[PDB]
Amino acid sequence: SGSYQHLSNVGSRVMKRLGNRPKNFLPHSEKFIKKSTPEFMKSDLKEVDEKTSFKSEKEWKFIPGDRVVVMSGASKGNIAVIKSFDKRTNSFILDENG
């Protein structure tokens, strides 16, 4: 992908318009993004923005490396250790037991 775009900030107005999409039209872009990515790439959770992402430990009720129980799912009742954050859907990623 030869663009040189990583060296200059051109089209600031257009970039801001694309990056500040109205919240009520988000499903429009969500649809194409989801249907244009492979199954092993995509996740079933809604991507979040800065104003609602968990940026502090108090917001993240759990921190990677602590045991937890999973319920309301196929692995209901399984005990696993959250291996890391997601930073994209405000979610956790567990170990193989999850």
């Binding site: 092993f40 790439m41 291996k83 997601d86 994209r88 990623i93």
Partner: peptide, 15 residues
């Protein structure tokens, strides 16, 4: 993400 999981699994295998 899958990227991070794959990376850490590569590192785990190397360890």
């Amino acid at each position: 993400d899958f990227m991070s999981w794959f990376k850490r699994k590569k590192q785990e295998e190397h360890q």
